[PDB]
Design an enzyme around this catalytic site. Structure first.
Site, PDB file in Angstrom:
ATOM      1  N   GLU A 412       0.829  -1.206   0.000  1.00 55.79           N
ATOM      2  CA  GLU A 412       0.000   0.000   0.000  1.00 55.79           C
ATOM      3  C   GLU A 412       0.864   1.257   0.000  1.00 55.79           C
ATOM      4  O   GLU A 412       0.852   2.055   0.939  1.00 55.79           O
ATOM      5  CB  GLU A 412      -0.970   0.003   1.183  1.00 55.79           C
ATOM      6  CG  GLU A 412      -1.587  -1.349   1.488  1.00 55.79           C
ATOM      7  CD  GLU A 412      -2.631  -1.281   2.586  1.00 55.79           C
ATOM      8  OE1 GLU A 412      -2.506  -0.411   3.473  1.00 55.79           O
ATOM      9  OE2 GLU A 412      -3.574  -2.100   2.565  1.00 55.79           O
ATOM     10  N   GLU A 497      -3.898  -9.285   1.879  1.00 61.31           N
ATOM     11  CA  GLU A 497      -4.651  -8.971   3.083  1.00 61.31           C
ATOM     12  C   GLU A 497      -6.133  -9.093   2.776  1.00 61.31           C
ATOM     13  O   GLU A 497      -6.600  -8.612   1.742  1.00 61.31           O
ATOM     14  CB  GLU A 497      -4.336  -7.567   3.600  1.00 61.31           C
ATOM     15  CG  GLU A 497      -2.889  -7.378   3.996  1.00 61.31           C
ATOM     16  CD  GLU A 497      -2.642  -6.052   4.680  1.00 61.31           C
ATOM     17  OE1 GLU A 497      -3.613  -5.450   5.181  1.00 61.31           O
ATOM     18  OE2 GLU A 497      -1.477  -5.609   4.714  1.00 61.31           O
TER      19      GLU A 497
END
Length: 1209
Positions: A412, A497
């Site tokens: 991210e 995730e």
């Protein structure tokens, strides 16, 4: 500064007798150089996280992301001398980790600096040391400026520090890369081709002829294949590489279910004599990520059932510990996990070793952020200069590990949508490929999530980066799992995730409503799986998305184990300090989702019936059964409650799985609660029982039983043992909502490393000897010391029976041999004239953490011992060894009547407990039912004190209680209606005529367009000083809350605060229990101030915004009363009816020495005007009794202590 203990080992431990001092009053100068005087600093063993020891700070700059735990600047020092055996050879100082911006000095000179926090670094020390024999001074500065992470990170030297001592010609730092190229084609012939590449550094003054002998040792220690290379020159001051090829016949492949490993011993031979030996452990395994068939280790297809762990180890902080890491890896393995994704930082060496031993895959992740930093002091500040070094370091350290399967480049990262992002991603992948070409690279990207329903149209630069990396990981982007596979058939996808659901242990609120990022007043989250973050999903949703697709290599659910920091739903609540994501709490106690994943991912049968069985009568409760069996039926108190079942479904490619018609993966009932036992029996397709589980209603709290996971530990000074302290019912059932304070006492060859309960909203410091239970359990960690022996732990809860457990500590040498380590002690509690029972067999523990029951012969127990109330020891002998067994018996019961007291109003019977506490004159606190005599209202009306008789059921004696009276009688209800009165006439410091103050108790709120009813102090000039509202009543009754409904407009703003005061007829005073919530706009509010004498209640308001006025629409107050009186302090104190010699109001404790063997004395106390006094007569020969006094209505109080003792025998 004692000299370093050197016994010829290549790597020497360096954790002993350091010093520490955290900066608190600004920079401390001169700490760099040897001349500093550090005699006043504290001494500690090196693996040390100084932030966990600090207490939680509401104002810490690491607000709610670091867990409110301060870092800062800290100094380390060590004075040492190098023995004469180490002179004339290379010495280097190896750190496995110092959290950030470390600067290490030696002998006053700067030795280096390593900004990154999670990577090992090394310095060459041989030249810097003093060879005169004088004392060196190593200094390490740590600069963890606060807002530097999105999760709790710790601070200081939190990993082991070593010295590496080697001959001038030696294997390089990571100078061995043993691989098995083309293993898939070879294994078909039952043969593994091993290629070994070793790098030899020649730090001598001249070139030398170097030869290498490399031998592969089997798992058990027997030679497999030895090869010697050809002698070649090694130039001075350079690295000269070798290379060798061998084979292994019938190699034993490393596997998840059978983690075998080999051992390569590299011997550097110069002049026909060994000069250096190096040991690296490898494995023979090959894995493939196929774009259509998914992951497969060796030739076997499997899913990457994974969890996304952090490095924090909970109670003991970031400090690494082999046993703790191995314990949490064992729990995750028990959940059915295959892989670990070390989140946003490389793994510690202990984690990799535990993964290699237990058989778990690893995905190492290098950076949380590239040059674009996420926090002001994050590593992105250093990325441009240190990214290559750090990525190379991680890949070099981890290249030989068989567990590792991928190298992750980021997670991210915000600049991944730019051209510079593609350039730096290409750079990073190239740098990774420069060392390890046998494992794919990877990136974790979340920006593809989009609307979370339809296949997002992928960004161009994100597509470029996804093309650069070998495997693409998608964060919370389940909507693209198959869309991107169709659009880009060459991409290999997996879920980095998934399912960021939130859950607290043993909390079962909101059973039928599924919320998203919702806070609750209790600062907890529901364990029913109905709570998750907005961008996340329920665990079932993500598992169903992953399960259906063959090509998805797997998923890595979020956080795995709870960790400190990042309580997402509570983004700014102060008590909220720790995550809610993990399937296992911080203490290591599994939640219910643990058993959900157990059902989904494991193979062997089981069943878990989650919700506890302590509810109110007749209310329906949602009970789920996380089982992988095909049928379950509930048997509540013997009557079957119906049978639910699955459907044996199959995926597209033919993978069997179980699910209900509704599409739910768990069986569910809706039962009306009635106390008893609720049992679930899991039956297979043919009806055969294959598993069972039950939940039984718990009783009142009875004792505190301690369970130890490992009863035998090593004496190496660091092996931990985890002790589970859980409040229990008399039948041994854990009370599901107990929150008593447990006090731990640890004595022997060990110490208390830390305590925890797993509560995410508690700010109890982790480094203490007491901890509140949460949902009926609490944790205590004890670590052994260098001395063999025994560790005894003693736990005690006020009003509950204690318990003691023993942990035997043995030397490392004995741990490999089957010899007796100790015998557990027996604890028994019986009544007077009750003969204690002795088991026929007891468990004897050997040094190898094993062993079971053994026959024993108990000595005679005389009638005198148990025929009277007291405590005594019983000894016996086991048949296996000469060690003496031991059993402790506590004989206590009805001795004397128990005193009690209370206070109440006129005409209202006091609040007497329907379950009396039988605190006889023995120290036992059994509970039983009591039927109190009907107290007449005439006695309550009369001022003064009176005694009442309590009829305890089943006891030989009756109880008694004293009472106090006040004011007047009242019913349960607050108020029905007021016909008319002068009480509701409000008053205030200022009130605009158009905004009459009386509207605040008219009852009709005017939030909406309905008619305006409000108070408002509006004027043409500012009124920043504030205003107060006053109410009056003539009542004599109870109060519990103050409601506040606020009005706002362009001129009026909400108050900044609401300070409340009460008038007793003489002067104003502050009320207790304000509990004012956080600010708001056009919302309702309530303050929970406690019952208080409130002839008038007045609360003051100030504007929340300067230059703006105040307004309200309704404020509710109900009753009034009067204080007890102006009672003074204690009046009289006596022991056995005699004046206590040595008594004095100006002394803390009063000591009495009776003749030895004398009976325990009785104590009586009184206070002026019958002010409440707590009386606790002595019950035990050791210790000291204490008394307390309560008077008036303020802070007046005092403690009186009576130190009962006796003379010598």
């Amino acid at each position: 500064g004692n000299s370093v203990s050197y016994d010829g080992e290549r790597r020497v431990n360096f954790n002993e007798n350091w010093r520490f001092q955290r900066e608190t009053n600004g920079s401390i100068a001169g700490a760099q150089n040897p001349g500093f005087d550090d005699s006043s600093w504290r001494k500690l063993n090196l693996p040390h996280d100084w932030s966990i020891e600090l207490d939680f700070n509401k104002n810490s700059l690491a607000t709610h992301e670091g867990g409110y735990l301060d870092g800062g600047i800290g100094w380390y020092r060590k004075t040492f001398t190098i023995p004469e055996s180490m002179k004339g050879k290379r010495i280097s100082l190896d750190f496995d980790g110092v959290y950030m911006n470390s600067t290490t000095y030696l002998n006053g000179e700067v030795l280096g600096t390593y900004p990154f926090g999670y990577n090992a670094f090394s310095y060459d020390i041989s030249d810097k040391l003093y060879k005169d024999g004088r004392a060196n001074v190593l200094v390490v500065k740590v600069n963890n400026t606060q807002p530097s992470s999105r999760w709790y990170s710790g601070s200081g030297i939190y990993r082991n520090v070593y010295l590496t001592v080697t001959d001038p010609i030696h294997v390089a730092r990571y100078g061995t890369f043993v691989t098995t190229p083309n293993l898939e084609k070879s294994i078909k012939e039952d043969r593994a081709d091993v290629n070994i590449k070793t790098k030899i550094s020649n730090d001598a003054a001249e070139a030398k002829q170097v030869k290498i002998k490399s031998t592969i040792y089997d798992g058990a220690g027997n030679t497999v294949q030895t090869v010697e290379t050809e002698e070649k020159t090694a130039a001075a001051g350079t690295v000269t590489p070798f290379e060798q090829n061998t084979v292994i016949k019938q190699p034993k492949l490393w596997s998840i279910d059978k983690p075998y490993r080999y051992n390569l011993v590299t011997e550097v031979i110069v002049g026909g004599q060994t000069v250096d030996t190096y040991e690296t452990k490898f494995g023979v395994r090959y894995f493939k990520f196929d774009e259509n068939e998914g992951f497969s280790l060796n030739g076997e297809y499997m899913k990457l059932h994974g969890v996304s762990m952090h490095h924090d180890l909970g109670a003991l902080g970031a400090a690494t510990n082999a046993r703790g890491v191995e314990r949490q890896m064992q729990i995750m393995k028990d959940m059915g996990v295959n892989a670990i994704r070390v989140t946003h930082n490389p793994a510690s060496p202990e984690l990799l070793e535990a993964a290699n031993k237990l058989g778990l895959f690893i995905i190492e992740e290098a950076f949380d952020s590239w040059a674009q930093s996420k926090k002001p002091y994050d590593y992105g500040r250093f990325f441009n200069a240190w990214a290559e070094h750090d990525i190379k370091e991680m890949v070099d350290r981890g290249k030989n590990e068989p567990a590792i399967i991928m190298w992750s480049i980021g997670n991210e990262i915000y600049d991944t949508t730019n051209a510079a992002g593609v350039e730096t991603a290409r750079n990073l992948v190239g740098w990774v490929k420069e060392i390890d070409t046998t494992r794919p690279t990877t990136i974790g990207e979340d920006k593809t999530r989009g609307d979370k329903v339809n296949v997002t149209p992928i960004n161009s630069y994100i597509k470029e980066i996804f093309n650069i990396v070998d495997v693409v990981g998608l964060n919370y982007s389940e909507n693209n799992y198959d869309g991107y596979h169709k659009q880009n058939p060459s991409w290999k996808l997996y879920g980095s995730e998934t399912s960021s659901a939130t859950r607290s242990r043993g909390v079962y609120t909101h059973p039928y409503q599924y919320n998203q990022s919702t806070k609750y007043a209790d600062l907890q989250q529901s364990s029913y799986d109905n709570d998750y973050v907005g961008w996340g999903r329920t665990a079932e949703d993500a598992w169903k998305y992953d399960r259906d697709l063959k090509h998805i290599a797997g998923q890595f659910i979020w956080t795995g184990f709870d960790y400190i920091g990042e309580p997402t739903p509570y983004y700014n609540s102060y008590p909220a300090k720790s995550s809610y994501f993990g399937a296992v709490d911080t203490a290591g106690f599994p939640k219910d989702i643990f058993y959900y994943y157990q059902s989904q991912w494991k193979k062997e049968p089981m069943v878990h019936l989650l919700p506890h069985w302590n509810w109110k009568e007749g209310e329906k409760v949602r009970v789920l059964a996380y089982t992988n069996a095909s049928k379950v039926e509930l048997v509540l108190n013997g009557e079957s409650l119906g049978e639910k079942n699955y459907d044996n479904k199959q995926t597209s490619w033919g993978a069997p799985y179980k699910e209900t018609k509704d599409g739910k993966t768990y069986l569910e009932w809706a039962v009306p609660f009635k106390p008893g036992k609720l049992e679930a029996v899991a039956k297979d397709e043919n009806g055969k029982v294959i598993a069972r589980d039950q939940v039984v209603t718990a009783g009142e709290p009875a004792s505190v039983r301690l369970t130890a996971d490992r009863k035998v530990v090593k004496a190496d000074g660091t092996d931990l043992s985890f002790i589970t302290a859980d409040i229990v019912d008399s039948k041994g059932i854990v009370v599901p909502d107990a929150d008593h304070l447990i006090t731990f006492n640890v004595t022997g060859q060990g110490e208390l490393a830390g305590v925890d309960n797993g509560n995410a909203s508690s700010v109890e410091r982790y480094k203490d000897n007491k901890r509140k239970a949460f949902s009926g359990k609490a944790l205590a960690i004890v670590q052994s010391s260098k001395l063999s022996g025994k560790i005894t732990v003693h736990a005690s809860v006020a009003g509950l029976s204690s318990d003691s457990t023993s942990v035997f500590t043995v030397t490392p040498a004995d741990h490999d041999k089957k010899i007796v380590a100790g015998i557990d002690d027996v604890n028994l509690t019986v009544d007077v004239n009750e003969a204690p029972k002795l088991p026929s067999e007891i468990k004897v523990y050997y040094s190898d953490e094993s062993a079971a029951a053994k026959n024993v012969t108990w000595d005679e127990v005389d009638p005198k011992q148990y025929s009277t109330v007291g405590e005594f020891t019983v000894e016996g002998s086991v048949e296996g060894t000469s060690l003496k067994a031991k059993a402790f018996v506590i004989v206590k019961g009805i001795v004397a009547v128990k005193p009690y007291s209370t206070a109440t109003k006129v005409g209202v019977q006091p609040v007497l407990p329907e379950k009396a506490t039988l605190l006889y004159s023995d120290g036992t606190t059994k509970g039983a039912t009591v039927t109190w005599d009907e107290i007449p209202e005439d006695k309550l009306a009369k001022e003064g004190r009176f005694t009442v008789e309590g009829s305890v059921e089943g006891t030989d004696l009756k109880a008694n209680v004293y009472v106090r009276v006040t004011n007047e009688v009242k019913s349960v209800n607050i108020m029905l209606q007021e016909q008319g009165s002068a009480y509701p006439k409000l008053e205030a410091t200022f009130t605009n005529p158009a905004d009459n103050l009386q509207h605040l108790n008219d009852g009709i709120k005017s939030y909406t367009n309905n008619p305006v009813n409000r108070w408002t102090n509006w004027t043409r000039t500012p009124r920043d000083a504030g205003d107060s509202i006053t109410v009056n009543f003539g009542k004599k009754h109870v109060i519990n809350n103050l409601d506040l409904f606020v009005f706002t407009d362009s001129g009026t703003v909400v108050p900044e605060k609401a300070e409340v005061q009460y008038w007793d007829g003489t002067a104003w005073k502050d009320v207790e229990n304000l509990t004012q919530p956080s600010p708001y706009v056009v919302e309702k509010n309530e303050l929970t101030f406690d019952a208080v004498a409130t002839e008038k209640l007045k609360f003051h308001l100030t504007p929340s915004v300067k230059g703006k006025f105040l307004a309200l629409t309704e404020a509710e107050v109900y009753a009034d009363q009067i204080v007890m009186g102006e009672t003074a302090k204690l009046q009289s104190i006596t022991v056995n009816g005699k004046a206590l010699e040595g008594f004095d109001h100006a002394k803390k404790n009063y000591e009495l020495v009776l003749p030895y063997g004398s009976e325990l004395p009785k104590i009586e106390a009184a206070a002026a005007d019958n002010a409440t006094v707590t009386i606790l007569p002595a019950f035990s020969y050791p210790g000291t009794a204490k008394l307390f006094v309560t008077s008036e209505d303020g802070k007046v109080t005092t403690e009186y202590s009576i130190g009962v003792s006796t003379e010598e025998p």
